[PDB]
Scaffold this active site. Structure first.
Site, mmCIF file in Angstrom:
data_model
loop_
_atom_site.group_PDB
_atom_site.id
_atom_site.type_symbol
_atom_site.label_atom_id
_atom_site.label_comp_id
_atom_site.label_asym_id
_atom_site.label_seq_id
_atom_site.Cartn_x
_atom_site.Cartn_y
_atom_site.Cartn_z
ATOM 1 C CG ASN A 161 -7.517 1.132 9.939
ATOM 2 O OD1 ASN A 161 -8.640 1.093 9.427
ATOM 3 N ND2 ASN A 161 -7.284 1.711 11.111
ATOM 4 C CD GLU A 203 1.965 5.462 -5.828
ATOM 5 O OE1 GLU A 203 2.565 4.556 -5.205
ATOM 6 O OE2 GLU A 203 2.537 6.256 -6.611
HETATM 7 N N1 LIG Z 1 -1.418 -3.384 3.473
HETATM 8 C C1 LIG Z 1 -1.855 -2.131 3.719
HETATM 9 C C2 LIG Z 1 -1.164 -1.043 3.204
HETATM 10 C C3 LIG Z 1 -1.620 0.243 3.462
HETATM 11 N N2 LIG Z 1 -2.705 0.415 4.222
HETATM 12 C C4 LIG Z 1 -3.211 1.757 4.473
HETATM 13 O O1 LIG Z 1 -2.806 2.563 3.368
HETATM 14 C C5 LIG Z 1 -2.015 3.674 3.796
HETATM 15 C C6 LIG Z 1 -0.902 3.915 2.785
HETATM 16 O O2 LIG Z 1 -0.076 2.764 2.715
HETATM 17 P P1 LIG Z 1 1.035 2.670 1.566
HETATM 18 O O3 LIG Z 1 0.367 1.963 0.410
HETATM 19 O O4 LIG Z 1 2.313 2.118 2.134
HETATM 20 O O5 LIG Z 1 1.182 4.220 1.201
HETATM 21 P P2 LIG Z 1 2.446 5.130 1.586
HETATM 22 O O6 LIG Z 1 2.216 5.675 2.960
HETATM 23 O O7 LIG Z 1 3.727 4.388 1.273
HETATM 24 O O8 LIG Z 1 2.295 6.319 0.502
HETATM 25 C C7 LIG Z 1 1.005 6.857 0.198
HETATM 26 C C8 LIG Z 1 0.570 6.606 -1.251
HETATM 27 O O9 LIG Z 1 -0.832 6.899 -1.427
HETATM 28 C C9 LIG Z 1 -1.176 8.151 -1.078
HETATM 29 N N3 LIG Z 1 -2.190 8.432 -0.254
HETATM 30 C C10 LIG Z 1 -2.393 9.720 0.047
HETATM 31 N N4 LIG Z 1 -3.385 10.076 0.878
HETATM 32 C C11 LIG Z 1 -3.598 11.368 1.194
HETATM 33 N N5 LIG Z 1 -4.625 11.652 2.036
HETATM 34 N N6 LIG Z 1 -2.826 12.369 0.701
HETATM 35 C C12 LIG Z 1 -1.793 12.141 -0.142
HETATM 36 O O10 LIG Z 1 -1.013 13.138 -0.665
HETATM 37 C C13 LIG Z 1 -1.518 10.757 -0.528
HETATM 38 N N7 LIG Z 1 -0.507 10.460 -1.367
HETATM 39 C C14 LIG Z 1 -0.313 9.166 -1.661
HETATM 40 C C15 LIG Z 1 0.738 8.605 -2.565
HETATM 41 S S1 LIG Z 1 1.094 9.286 -4.062
HETATM 42 C C16 LIG Z 1 1.317 7.477 -2.215
HETATM 43 S S2 LIG Z 1 2.792 7.043 -2.919
HETATM 44 C C17 LIG Z 1 -1.512 3.304 5.177
HETATM 45 O O11 LIG Z 1 -1.356 4.452 6.022
HETATM 46 C C18 LIG Z 1 -2.593 2.376 5.696
HETATM 47 O O12 LIG Z 1 -3.627 3.162 6.280
HETATM 48 C C19 LIG Z 1 -3.386 -0.697 4.735
HETATM 49 O O13 LIG Z 1 -4.398 -0.520 5.433
HETATM 50 N N8 LIG Z 1 -2.947 -1.946 4.485
HETATM 51 O O1 MOS Z 2 4.905 7.719 -5.372
HETATM 52 MO MO1 MOS Z 2 3.440 8.747 -4.851
HETATM 53 O O2 MOS Z 2 4.608 10.039 -4.217
HETATM 54 S S1 MOS Z 2 3.358 9.672 -6.940
#
Ligand SMILES: Nc1ccn([C@@H]2O[C@H](COP(=O)(O)OP(=O)(O)OC[C@H]3Oc4nc5nc(N)nc(O)c5nc4C(S)=C3S)[C@@H](O)[C@H]2O)c(=O)n1
Ligand code: MOS
Ligand SMILES: Cc1cc2nc3c(=O)[nH]c(=O)nc-3n(C[C@H](O)[C@H](O)[C@H](O)COP(=O)(O)OP(=O)(O)OC[C@H]3O[C@@H](n4cnc5c(N)ncnc54)[C@H](O)[C@@H]3O)c2cc1C
Ligand code: SF4
Ligand code: FES
Ligand code: FES
Lengths: 330, 748, 157
Positions: free
Chosen positions: B641, B715
């Site tokens: 997205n 991240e």
């Molecule tokens: N190829 C991709 C991958 C991801 N996404 C978008 O990015 C989001 C996050 O994808 P991902 O990189 O898999 O992140 P995770 O859901 O595995 O984990 C979230 C990540 O980044 C975060 N985003 C956050 N956002 C909010 N609002 N609050 C937190 O505490 C958050 N904490 C975190 C932390 S720390 C981490 S580890 C997805 O819902 C999607 O909308 C995308 O568009 N295309």
């Molecule tokens: O790996 Mo994100 O929970 S610091």
């Protein structure tokens, strides 16, 4: 919080009569009072709400006296159509403080009486040595991290800085605090005498009897107030107290600075009028370097502590740049 | 754009409306009947014993039912640590003994009938201590150093290559204690009933919460239900519960009543860990053209006396550039402090900061433009793993970022660019984050009304999981994704792993894509196999699923709600996922119930990449710093997205701005207290701190990285930002600030 | 030991008898079951608790429910119309993705409604400054500026 008893006052005199009783405290905006109650430094057995006292809500700007009652909010004063034009330093000391939500809540009376942001003062459950809170118990900040503490007006008992911006603008421009006792009579206190040096008694901040309540403030309407600025230096850009700040103003009469007014916020135990920087610039035409070098005179009364040495470097520079910003207006 | 809004579309958040009207219910906003209120007690000294504790004035106050301490205890079992395959980041067990291992440690809880009664009475507990000498800082005497040897990098020969290097840069880079500070405080509702417990816990991993709470209580994992449909963010601080939840659970079991327990905002500083302080001594050997032939690194980070957690500064050190000889060793320093915790890009953030400042110093030592230096060190493969990149667009990130930022007009000399009273500075840094993968499952249901519901236990912490899982299913179901409802964040839902390491979008989109394909096949088969269906005899190959109906290419049709009426309810529920079809269910539980089964591609090094460009304005008199412009070009691979991806990108960048300019833990050396624990003295970026932010998408779909083609997003935005801001401040001023944050006192 | 007051919350009267220590924030959350207003700090340092009292944005964690006696409180749940169309601020926030986790969003939205009424929407930087009293840890600020710029335009018609 402590299980206080809630009492509503219907007049200024009944608020002063109730305030006088054994640890009772006024509640106006709550943004200081209620916060420090949760911190544990305030435990009033009786809390007196004074909002809904309509007599204290008057505000007007004149050719002579800017006049506002104690219940005027920060926003009402700053949003009045004449505030920015007639008193820029007062206006700048307002919108640069706290957040719009807080400024809508914050009355002028409670703004003057706000308390130090000293981290040891605000956590009595952790640190029990605070002379301001707890007379005779010591001062936890002397040997602690004093980054936020005073380079001017400090004593052995308290190094706490007075954080408020508005009082700094008022002290520079010679505002008067009008207070009232339970029998209805009135005291007028020049504002530089209203804020007390801590000395051996940091628990006495203001010249106010338990008898008395702040009902109004007035400022002399002067061309020095018309040409003025409030410059605030802080770590982030908004929603924080000053690391250093200066309210400055003067009237330019015959191409020359006259009635130079300068006061220092955030570096001192109380809002600090720099009288010798003023005198050094009086009868002088506005110019870059003479303003900067005159401002450095504040460094002859300044005393750095362990962690606040940066405030010594900031103090003359916020004085100079506030003046420079003032001389760009009219 | 396109009406179904499938995967790859940029649509609004499916959870957006319930969030903007205040309908979405976070953990403590749920309503069990007659809940009690707990308030946690925390120690005021760093090291020692509790010599005297008197709760009687607290037990005697209004509405106070109980005060649980080590003197009036409740059994809490030591949980299994994450590194051992468990769900526990901190193995601390409160109220089991009188020992104080850090300041602000949870030593008890006060239970009352109202929140106001619990807050007041907690202040009436009197605690005396016998203090022992405390280790406050990682550099103090007597601090034990434990090397993390399994994470050591021994690559090529660094000692030989460094000894022969023509240009050597040797400097130390530090980061302070930092705190995730999500706007939702850590809080929970523990409800114990009849040998089972239900806990409303804000969580990025609900299977992890289920495991650790069951271990605390000493009951089977299946006996715990975790309800967390909405989270106010953890940024690494809520993958697993912390001990205030342990106190809430045992209290609820003892009183046989629901207990709402909120950490106060100050208590969230010592009730769990943030990013631990790090220090790295980083040496870069290079030939005079700028090409780096050797890197030697020695780093350390704080950890408690109890748990060993490493914030490892070598994570990016050998990954980023083409360097054949790299020696890095990291150790943890056990001190009196709370067990550390994850913060956005753990170990990757401080690794990139030191590396990407050191590149800037190497560039000014050789008078090479910093961007030009990153190109001379370009790595056409991964030199750490000796593997080819799956996809790496970093070069296009450099070029598109430099173009938009105007980097070609940079004057190299520090202080050369000025406007009015502000010194201007321009800085840049490379960034990266690794691709992790884990299996996961999901379920899709056709309701009797002809509507689709997607079920997964994965969390939406603000990342957008609610939205992208609906887009994934829409691709195969012939409806718009805005009509698809998604249920998340509950242990009653299908298996899902942690949201951490930025892996969960790829793991869940894969699981739902399989389930949705299986749902398509089920519906078409039902239309052809159900004798009462108007499609009763027809071949599935000539069926299409369009606009809420199944339509034969011969022109006859059947609506989704009509098929629901003709079908048995159990056939309307389809399960799918990325676990091996033959894997036994117990192993599928175990895989998602720990953190150590994540995989990365063999034969390819798969990572996201970024280029960060920053302009700062430093006031010549005051030394204050403001971020004027931010231009970022990011390779996240395929964007599921693009609108939610940008929100992640700029979200990480803003957190990196707070990291560089403001965020610092302030510790009093005498008592080891963190005295800035509050949102007034711990500064996070304010809206006025952040300018307009430009993000450029340079990525392409990578199917060697993830099944669905995306790479890490969540991240990526923070990585390298703090270095680029420091590089920019140097360019404006001429002062290298190698310890974070860069505050006005360090400038003048 | 207890006090009595009546409060106008989103157009409906709410008589209460409560511990005087109960803040307006916790009267909405723990008592009236309106949980849209959020507690992120409770000391007034964040703004997730931002509500409207007599048309003005304030912090409900530093407001006692006693101080709201005879006052009009507008929480996030009252921005929808009687039919419940989204307020322009609420809809622009979704379209521009001005939130992520949603926890600061109710206070963000209520503060932006008042920010517009106050006349502080005049420019992007002005919005940034006069919205700075609401912390967003998710980092949605750039989209909050977009949502408020767009909503101020729609409302001017
Ligand atoms: N190829 C991709 C991958 C991801 N996404 C978008 O990015 C989001 C996050 O994808 P991902 O990189 O898999 O992140 P995770 O859901 O595995 O984990 C979230 C990540 O980044 C975060 N985003 C956050 N956002 C909010 N609002 N609050 C937190 O505490 C958050 N904490 C975190 C932390 S720390 C981490 S580890 C997805 O819902 C999607 O909308 C995308 O568009 N295309
Ligand atoms: O790996 Mo994100 O929970 S610091
Ligand atoms: C997060 C945060 C940030 C802030 N930042 C700033 C800043 O940058 N600059 C700044 O200047 N201020 C700042 N403030 C403080 C704010 O400006 C003050 O709290 C506010 O002005 C106090 O007014 P009030 O009406 O809330 O007073 P209250 O909190 O109601 O009262 C304050 C004190 O004054 C007493 N009092 C009130 N009225 C009277 C009266 N009529 N007579 C006698 N005594 C009275 C009360 O008993 C109480 O002890 C900040 C506050 C917070 C919480
Ligand atoms: S400085 Fe003043 S306030 Fe701060 S601790 Fe020492 S005495 Fe108490
Ligand atoms: S909860 Fe009121 S400002 Fe944080
Ligand atoms: S939306 Fe998560 S804090 Fe702003």
């Amino acid at each position: 919080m402590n299980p206080f008893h809630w009492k509503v006052a219907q007049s200024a005199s009944e608020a002063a009569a109730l305030k006088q009783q054994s640890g009772s405290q006024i509640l106006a905006g709550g943004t200081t009072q209620l916060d420090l109650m949760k911190c544990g430094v305030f435990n009033p057995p009786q809390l007196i709400g004074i909002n809904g006292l309509s007599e204290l809500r008057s505000l007007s700007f004149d050719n002579d006296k800017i006049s506002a009652g104690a219940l005027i909010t920060m926003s009402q004063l700053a949003d009045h159509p004449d505030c920015q034009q007639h008193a820029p330093a007062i206006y700048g000391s307002l919108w640069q403080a706290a957040s719009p939500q807080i400024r809508n809540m914050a009355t002028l009376g409670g703004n003057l009486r706000q308390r130090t942001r000293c981290a040891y003062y605000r956590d009595p459950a952790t640190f029990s040595a605070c002379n301001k809170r707890n007379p005779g118990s010591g001062c936890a900040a002397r040997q602690g991290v004093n980054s936020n503490h005073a380079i001017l007006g400090a004593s052995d008992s308290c190094i706490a800085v007075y954080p408020g911006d508005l009082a700094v603008a008022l002290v520079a421009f010679d505002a008067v605090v009008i207070v009232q006792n339970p029998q209805g009579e009135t005291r007028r206190i020049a504002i530089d005498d209203f804020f007390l040096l801590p000395g051996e008694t940091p628990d006495q901040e203001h010249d106010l009897r338990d008898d008395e309540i702040i009902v109004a403030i007035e400022v002399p309407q002067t061309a020095s107030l018309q040409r003025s600025h409030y410059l605030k230096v802080r770590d982030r850009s908004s929603y924080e107290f000053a690391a250093a700040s200066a309210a400055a103003g003067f009237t330019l009469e015959n191409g020359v600075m006259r009635q130079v007014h300068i006061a220092l916020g955030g570096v001192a135990t109380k809002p600090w009028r720099a009288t010798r920087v003023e005198q050094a610039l009086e009868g002088q035409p506005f110019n870059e370097e003479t303003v900067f070098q005159a401002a450095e005179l504040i460094n002859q009364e300044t005393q750095a502590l362990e962690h606040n040495a940066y405030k010594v470097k900031l103090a003359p520079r916020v004085i100079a740049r506030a003046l420079m910003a003032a001389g760009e207006i009219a | 754009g396109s009406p179904i809004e499938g995967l790859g579309a940029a649509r609004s958040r499916g959870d957006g409306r319930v969030k903007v009207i205040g309908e979405a219910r976070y953990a403590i906003e749920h309503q069990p009947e007659n809940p009690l209120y707990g308030v946690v007690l925390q120690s005021t000294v760093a090291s020692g014993r509790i010599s005297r504790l008197s709760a009687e004035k607290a037990l005697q106050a209004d509405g106070v039912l109980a005060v649980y301490t080590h003197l009036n205890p409740l059994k809490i079992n030591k949980p299994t640590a994450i590194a051992d395959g468990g769900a526990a980041q901190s193995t601390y067990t409160p109220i089991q003994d009188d020992v104080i291992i850090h300041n602000g440690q949870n030593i008890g809880i006060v239970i009352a009938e109202t929140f106001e009664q619990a807050t007041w009475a907690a202040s009436l507990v009197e605690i005396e201590y016998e203090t022992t000498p405390a280790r406050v800082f990682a550099t103090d005497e007597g601090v034990e150093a434990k090397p993390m040897s399994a994470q050591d990098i021994d690559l090529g020969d660094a000692a030989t290559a460094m000894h022969s290097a023509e240009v050597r840069i040797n400097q130390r880079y530090t980061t302070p204690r930092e705190y995730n500070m999500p706007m939702e405080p850590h809080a929970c509702i523990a409800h114990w009933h009849e040998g089972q417990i239900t806990v409303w816990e804000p969580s990025q991993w609900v299977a992890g919460a289920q495991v650790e709470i069951a271990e605390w209580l000493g009951i089977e994992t299946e006996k715990v239900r975790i309800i967390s449909p909405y989270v106010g963010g953890g940024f690494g601080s809520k993958p697993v519960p912390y001990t205030h939840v342990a106190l809430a659970s045992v209290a609820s079991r003892a009183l046989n009543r629901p207990v709402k327990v909120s950490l106060t905002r100050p208590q969230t500083f010592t009730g769990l860990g943030g990013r631990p302080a790090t220090s790295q001594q980083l040496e870069l050997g290079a030939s005079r053209d700028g090409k780096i032939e050797a890197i030697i690194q020695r780093s350390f980070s704080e950890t408690s006396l109890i748990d060993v957690f490493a914030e490892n500064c070598s994570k990016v050190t050998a990954r980023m550039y083409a360097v054949s000889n790299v020696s890095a060793q990291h150790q943890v320093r056990l001190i009196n402090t709370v067990t550390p915790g994850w913060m956005r890009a753990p170990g990757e953030n401080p690794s990139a900061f030191g590396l990407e400042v050191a590149m800037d110093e190497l560039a000014y030592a050789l008078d090479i433009d910093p961007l030009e230096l990153r190109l001379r060190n370009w790595a056409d493969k991964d030199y750490q793993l000796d593997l080819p990149w799956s996809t790496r667009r970093l070069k296009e990130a450099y070029q598109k970022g430099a173009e938009a930022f105007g980097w070609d007009k940079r004057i190299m000399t520090p202080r050369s660019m000025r406007e009015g009273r502000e010194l201007i500075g321009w800085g840049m840094a490379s960034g990266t984050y690794p691709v992790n993968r884990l299996p996961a499952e999901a379920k899709i249901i056709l309701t009797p009304q002809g509507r689709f519901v997607v079920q997964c236990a994965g969390a939406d912490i603000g990342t957008g999981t609610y939205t992208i899982l609906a887009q994934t299913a829409a691709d195969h179901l012939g409806v718009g994704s805005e009509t698809i409802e998604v249920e998340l964040g509950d242990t009653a839902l299908p298996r899902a792993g942690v949201a951490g390491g930025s892996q969960l979008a790829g793991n869940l989109t894969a699981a739902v894509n399989d389930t949705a394909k299986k749902m398509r096949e089920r519906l078409l088969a039902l239309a052809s196999e159900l004798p009462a269906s108007p499609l009763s005899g027809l071949p599935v190959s000539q069926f299409t699923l369009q606009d809420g109906a199944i339509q034969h290419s011969g022109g006859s049709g059947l609506s989704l709600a009509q098929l629901a009426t003709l079908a048995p309810p159990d056939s309307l529920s389809v399960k799918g996922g990325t676990f091996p079809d033959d894997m036994p269910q117990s192993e599928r539980d175990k895989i998602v119930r720990n953190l150590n089964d994540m995989s990365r591609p063999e034969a390819f090094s798969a990572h996201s990449w970024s280029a960060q460009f920053v302009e700062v304005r430093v006031d010549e008199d005051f030394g204050t710093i403001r971020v004027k412009r931010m231009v970022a070009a990011l390779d996240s691979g395929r964007l599921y997205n693009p609108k939610l991806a940008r929100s992640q990108w700029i979200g990480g960048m803003i957190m990196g701005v707070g990291q560089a300019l403001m965020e610092e833990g302030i510790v009093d050396p005498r008592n080891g207290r963190v005295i800035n624990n509050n949102l007034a003295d711990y500064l996070v970026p304010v809206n006025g701190d952040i300018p307009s932010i430009t993000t450029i998408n340079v990525g392409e779909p990578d199917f060697e990285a993830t099944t669905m083609g995306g790479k890490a997003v969540g991240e990526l935005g923070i990585v390298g930002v703090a270095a680029a801001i420091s590089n920019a401040v140097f360019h404006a001023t001429g002062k290298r600030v190698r310890g974070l944050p860069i505050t006005l006192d360090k400038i003048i | 030991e207890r006090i009595s007051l009546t409060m106008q919350v989103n157009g409906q009267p709410y008589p209460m008898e409560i511990d005087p220590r109960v803040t307006l924030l916790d009267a909405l959350r723990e008592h009236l079951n309106l949980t849209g207003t959020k507690k992120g700090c409770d000391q007034g340092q964040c703004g997730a608790c931002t509500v409207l009292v007599n048309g003005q944005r304030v912090l409900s964690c530093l407001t006692l429910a006693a101080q709201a006696d005879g006052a009009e409180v507008t929480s996030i749940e009252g921005l929808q119309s009687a039919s419940g169309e989204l307020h322009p601020v609420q809809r622009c926030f979704v379209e521009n993705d001005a939130f992520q986790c949603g926890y600061c969003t109710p206070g963000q939205i209520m503060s932006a409604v008042a920010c517009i009424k106050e006349g502080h929407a005049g420019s992007d930087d002005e919005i940034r400054e006069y919205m700075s009293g609401n912390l967003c840890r998710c980092g949605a600020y750039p989209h909050i500026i977009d949502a408020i710029k767009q909503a101020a335009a729609e409302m001017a018609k």
